[PDB]
Amino acid sequence: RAKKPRKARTAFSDHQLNQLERSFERQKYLSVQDRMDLAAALNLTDTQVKTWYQNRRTKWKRQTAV
């Protein structure tokens, strides 16, 4: 067990995942404002959205490479 507390793993709802994915198809990168807006719309934290987008870009790149 890590010495430093980690954050609990967020479980996204179906609506949140749908909306995150619709954002991603439109824009692969968000401005600060568009990110902080999407977080508010989905009742997520700014960092949860930032992280989701970052990890989603990793997945996107993996799949561009096949």
Contact pick of 23, 38, 39, 53 for DNA (by CB under 7 A): 53
Q: Which of 12, 19, 24, 37 binds DNA (CB under 7 A)?
A: 12
Q: Are 48 and 39 in contact (CB under 8 A)?
A: yes
Cβ atoms of 54 and 30 closer than 8 Å: no
Positions in 28-47 near DNA (CB under 7 A): 29-30, 32, 35, 47
Residue 19 as a binder of DNA (CB under 7 A): the answer is: no
Answer for which of 13, 40, 41, 59 binds DNA (CB under 7 A) is: 59
CA angle, residues 40, 55, 59, in degrees to nearest 5: 130
